[PDB]
Nucleic acid binder design. Structure first.
Ligand SMILES: Nc1ncnc2c1ncn2[C@@H]1O[C@H](COP(=O)(O)OP(=O)(O)O)[C@@H](O)[C@H]1O
Ligand SMILES: Nc1ncnc2c1ncn2[C@@H]1O[C@H](COP(=O)(O)OP(=O)(O)O)[C@@H](O)[C@H]1O
Ligand code: ALF
Ligand code: ALF
Ligand SMILES: [Zn+2]
Ligand SMILES: [Zn+2]
Lengths: 673, 673
RNA sequence: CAAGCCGAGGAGAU
RNA sequence: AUCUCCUCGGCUUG
RNA sequence: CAAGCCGAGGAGAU
RNA sequence: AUCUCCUCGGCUUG
């Protein structure tokens, strides 16, 4: 039942017989089916050759593993050969090393294979080796970067290949190397100004993957052009001339606070430079142990945030954010009670809270023209996607769609999607919820999906009529991927952003980067085999050598590991909180203090299933981890300061591993009875 | 007359002189006779040593106690020493504490000993202590888990041992500790990915049992391999491609109901996630007190059940289940009479009942291939067991065997067996009936026994030629036990399940778990005695400490016990049903309401020797318990809602003890005259 | 034979 | 940690 | 479902 | 090289 198209067979012909290559075709070009056919043919050849046929497939995202196992690989190849799909969400309850030699076909995330190989090197597990495989297939090869995971596996393979090459001249016996196939659409450019540098980057990618070709379609290119229709470009610009009253009032309170705390800004208000200066002042206050510096800096950062989102988000969201932050602060202080500067800030906000609320309520936007374009397009159509910067922006957009009655009149369905993980005050989503949202959009129940960069990569959809980016541009690879994600016969590509910012210049930069992409692929494809191979060998040895010395330097970097040489103090108040030995380590990951003498210092607080800790000052410290029954008080070094026993050089790390000195584990015999 | 085999003596030699150990041999390896010989030798040594010899045997199942008392222990050891067999079914009319010091040999379920020790601690009874015994023997040691009953007894013993160890350094006098012997075949793995974690689990088991060895046969292993023949593996797969017409019609009515009640599914149809969402909506409706939510959710759950069994059961059973459920509902409503949505559901079923019956009657299965394999094997043989998920599945299989004429032509005898207890709409069986069925199968009168997980553990049979699992896999321990239960010279092991499900992956996972078992036992057996003992002591103190703080937390959890602070309302209709004090408690277990004012609210209903109660809405509430003459109306909190006097936070418990506030007992003087 | 109560174990999904 | 689904033992009542 | 830990990638500013 | 801001994967705990 397997089917092929003339361009598919043309591109895949070299790979049918050896030729460990890369295939760079646009999105929705059957690349998945090309890989499926190549796998089927390779396994058929292995069976005909009376040789073991092992195929492994690597995908950076967890979801794409299930997607391939469900839609392309298993349905077409279920009957002939055994198939299994592995992932972090999936419980590989059997093992990796033997399932390698059980099902003859593996689809797994790269990190699992990497972990298995590291375990083998450590010797704890029997482990697996690349020799066990006969064919390695990689999706989204552009991620093979300086030391990405794909790059780690490929560096191991390339060290093996270099050893094999050395033996070729030294000794006949050699370790077999599986064939390598890579699939991508935009290999990418490492921000290279010179087309020489662009082709250098392309050759670096090839060397990392040992591609020895790109093998792009040239004959049936007209057929592809007919098949795939590029979306129509559209540029939208805006100016934040309005918002004067409330913005001016907010700036006035900013200036009042700044003069109260005499902060020479050393930058213009409303920029990342100002936030960096504020954080540097945070650090300086930590090294000096004074107040009046960190609280005001954090408040200014929050107001700057509010302003930046306001340029792209409605005020109500910013005001709610600020109100929640101040509510949390007030609850902290109220719990602690049970200075004139914190009082100044809080009482200033309380006194002006009503007037600020009324002032934000008044009129005086990108939002009005965004609504105009969206509804005009929807009537002109009788799917849509929004790409933005931060998750709260997606939530605000969803709220705007729901509340506004015009969208209800149109009846467009919408839902907010965001990435997983905890990212500094954005709620972590769950993978199952992401799969649910994607499936709901696929079945047509959701007509408008708002997503962050997550949807840019993978997250394939059969068609997406409308792709409207909203103030998001990062690089050419993301731009091209998002553009190709439309896959609709009649697509509409729109970019919305402020004219003052450099975002339009960035979009045209990405356009030229795409053009330079092709300008470099066509060049590299036409190169002398001898000089070409010399370049690949050079780049391969470069990568291997760099990795070797990187490992050496990492070994040489972390060596001190002293038992106890410091005193840990509260950052807000320079008081002796803990010694260099009273701390204990559990699970080899978490830190705790068990002596009750500490319990007389900190204050437990719980308002919400794990409580938290706070200082006498109100500074948050950590949580109460319920492990093995024990409610161990875990503390985050992110909210503490260190004082070495000698010279008292105060240092703040935000992180434990950055501290070279180690702490002892918790001996449960100590807490006997 | 006692006999031993070289592997038996080899494994038992360490235990002959002290050495409180575990013995892990495959099934049917004489383990029972090994225990009998060890007991006999120990008692002979005690007599020769002029010391009291007390032996106690613990079995988790009630039936195995009688089995050991009948087949292995008493017949061989009747003459030399007194023997008695205790159990829940058996009436220990004398007492436990003195029969400990009466017959010199005890065979009892662990729970009885546990209860006696708890009574001793409470002081109500004179009680018994482990010191009274000289040897404790445990069967199926793998059940010694986080706080299993075996684990509770072993934790008490280990606290005693820790006290004795402390005295060893402090004071010469110490409390003697009886020797400990354990018998098992598959100690098990706690779903451990790392062989380090597997051996950690094994060491945890040893510490709980103080085994200090495993002592597995290594020398005569060839003799065991020759003696015991492993069954031949066989994998059977199927796809539910058929069933399209009636399944599609059922899905259509599902969709009609869902759109009528606008249930955003938040999951795919036909999965436990959908049922969980339905129950969450049950809870939400309870907190809001609206209809149109719970009835439809329950109907959808019933249809989802029907579908799931249909994948593995004939439709007629599902249709009969649905028909009985709707008949019960209609009888409820008819009794109540003597909304448009309940009417919608019931009238929809009535209108389509004839067409649904005809549609289920038509053709379009795992059943056909199951019948094929069963009959082909039976002719190829000229006993059989089926393991399944739910009891109604066993009943359907028995009906299929009886009705189908092909089995009659073969003449295979078959009967259905299931576990005891009430498990949410599956009839509770009786222990005597289970013993009857087992004896009938043993005597050869039954050639095919269908059983649930109950037959997996214990329920020993001299031989079982055929073991065919049918869509049942839970863990490696159950798999290995069932596999070894065959014990036939020429066995046939078969696993039948759908290809779409992950059941085959599970079976191979259990296979690798068995392999990892041996990979960990061989490792632990070869360990340094000092480091080993350090690990056992560590794990023992861990268990003791965890149990201590668990008891402390349990004490700290249940403290409120308020007399009357709530109002109890009907879940279906938010009406005031009872106050916080009008309820009374009897037998210290049952709850009742005595005031006749309540009798004017609920409706008594009886259709069948205890009647039941229903609301004005038709919601079932409870029964009429005939205790001490009184027909007290007992109500199940499972079908009610609570409303606290303050803040009215509605909460549903399904259970009484979960409610921390207590109710008064029934004072019979109140109901005088 | 029926009903009820207390605890415990395993699997699946959040 | 939670929810669902299955299984074991002990106790009581009739 | 919640929390925590390890690594990695991209963009911006010094 | 540093700081900031965003995203991915793996692990653990409950
Ligand atoms: N052999 C073929 N015959 C007909 N159509 C094909 C064939 N191969 C691919 N296609 C078309 O190309 C598309 C393949 O998209 P796909 O490769 O899954 O996108 P992506 O690679 O981005 O996941 C399908 O929508 C299908 O209609
Ligand atoms: N000393 C012996 N001499 C001969 N045969 C023995 C001896 N001990 C055990 N056997 C054989 O081993 C089997 C023991 O099975 P048994 O231990 O009762 O199974 P389980 O332990 O699963 O209940 C018997 O069928 C018997 O033939
Ligand atoms: F392989 Al794609 F979108 F190009 F999933
Ligand atoms: F002791 Al057995 F089956 F192994 F009863
Ligand atoms: Zn402080
Ligand atoms: Zn009611």
């Amino acid at each position: 039942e397997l089917q092929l198209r003339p361009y598919q067979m043309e591109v895949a012909q070299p790979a049918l017989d050896g030729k460990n290559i890369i295939i760079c075709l646009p999105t929705g070009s059957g690349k998945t089916r090309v890989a499926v056919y190549i796998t089927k043919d390779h396994l058929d050849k292995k069976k005909q050759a009376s040789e073991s046929g092992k195929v492994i497939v690597l995908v950076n995202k967890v979801m794409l593993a299930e997607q391939l196992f469900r839609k392309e690989f298993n349905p077409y190849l279920k009957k002939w050969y055994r198939i299994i799909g592995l992932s972090g969400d999936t419980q590989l309850k059997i093992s990796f090393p033997e399932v390698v030699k059980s099902y003859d076909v593996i689809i797994s995330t790269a990190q699992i294979l990497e972990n298995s190989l590291l375990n083998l090197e450590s010797g704890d597990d029997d482990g697996v080796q690349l020799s066990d495989f006969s064919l390695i297939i990689i999706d989204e090869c552009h991620h093979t970067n300086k030391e990405a995971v794909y790059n780690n596996i490929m560096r191991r393979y390339l060290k093996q290949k270099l050893r094999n090459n050395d033996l070729k001249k030294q000794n006949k016996p050699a370790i077999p190397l599986p064939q390598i196939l890579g699939l991508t659409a935009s290999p990418g450019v490492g921000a290279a100004k010179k087309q020489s540098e662009a082709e250098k980057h392309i050759l670096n990618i090839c060397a990392n993957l040992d591609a020895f070709t790109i093998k792009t379609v040239k004959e049936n290119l007209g057929q592809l052009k007919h098949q795939i229709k590029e979306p129509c470009k559209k540029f939208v610009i805006a100016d934040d001339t309005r918002e004067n009253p409330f913005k001016e009032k907010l700036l006035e309170i900013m200036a009042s606070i700044q003069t109260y705390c005499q902060k020479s800004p050393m930058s213009d208000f409303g920029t990342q430079h100002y936030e960096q200066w504020a954080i540097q002042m945070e650090k300086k206050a930590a090294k000096d142990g004074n107040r009046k510096d960190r609280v005001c800096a954090e408040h200014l950062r929050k107001y700057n945030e509010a302003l930046q989102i306001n340029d792209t988000i409605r005020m109500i969201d910013a005001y709610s954010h600020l109100e929640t932050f101040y509510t949390d602060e007030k609850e902290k202080k109220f719990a602690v009670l049970n200075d004139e500067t914190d009082e100044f800030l809080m009482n200033l906000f309380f006194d002006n809270k009503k007037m600020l609320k009324k002032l934000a309520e008044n009129p005086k936007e990108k939002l009005i023209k965004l609504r105009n374009t969206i509804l005009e397009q929807f009537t002109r159509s009788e799917r849509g996607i929004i790409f933005t910067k931060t998750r709260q922006s997606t939530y605000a957009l969803s709220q705007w769609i729901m509340e506004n009655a015009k969208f209800a009149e149109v009846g467009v369905k919408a839902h907010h999607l965001i990435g997983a993980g905890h990212s500094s005050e954005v709620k972590p989503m769950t993978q199952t919820e992401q799969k649910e949202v994607i499936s709901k959009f696929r079945t047509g129940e959701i007509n408008l999906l708002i997503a962050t960069t997550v949807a840019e990569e993978g997250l394939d959809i059969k068609e997406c009529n409308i792709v409207i980016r909203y103030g998001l541009v990062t690089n050419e690879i993301a731009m091209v991927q998002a553009r190709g994600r439309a896959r609709a016969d009649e697509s509409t590509y729109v970019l919305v952003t402020s004219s003052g910012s450099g975002v339009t210049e960035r979009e045209i930069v990405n356009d030229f980067r795409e053009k330079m992409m092709y300008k470099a692929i066509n060049r590299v494809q036409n190169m002398k085999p001898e000089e070409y191979a010399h370049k690949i060998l050079e780049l391969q040895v470069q990568s291997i050598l760099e990795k070797k010395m990187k490992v050496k330097r990492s070994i040489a970097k972390q060596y001190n590991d002293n038992p106890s040489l410091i005193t840990l103090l509260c950052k807000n108040c320079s008081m002796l909180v803990c010694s260099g030995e009273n701390i204990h380590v559990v699970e080899k990951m978490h830190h705790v203090n068990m002596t009750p003498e500490f319990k007389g210092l900190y204050i437990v607080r719980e308002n919400k299933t794990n409580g938290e800790i706070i200082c006498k000052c109100g500074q948050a410290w950590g949580t109460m981890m319920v492990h093995k029954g024990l409610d161990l008080p875990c503390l985050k070094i992110r909210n503490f300061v260190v004082n070495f026993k000698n010279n008292s050089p105060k240092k703040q790390y935000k992180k434990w591993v950055e501290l070279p000195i180690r702490f002892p584990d918790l001996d449960y015999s100590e807490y006997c009875l």
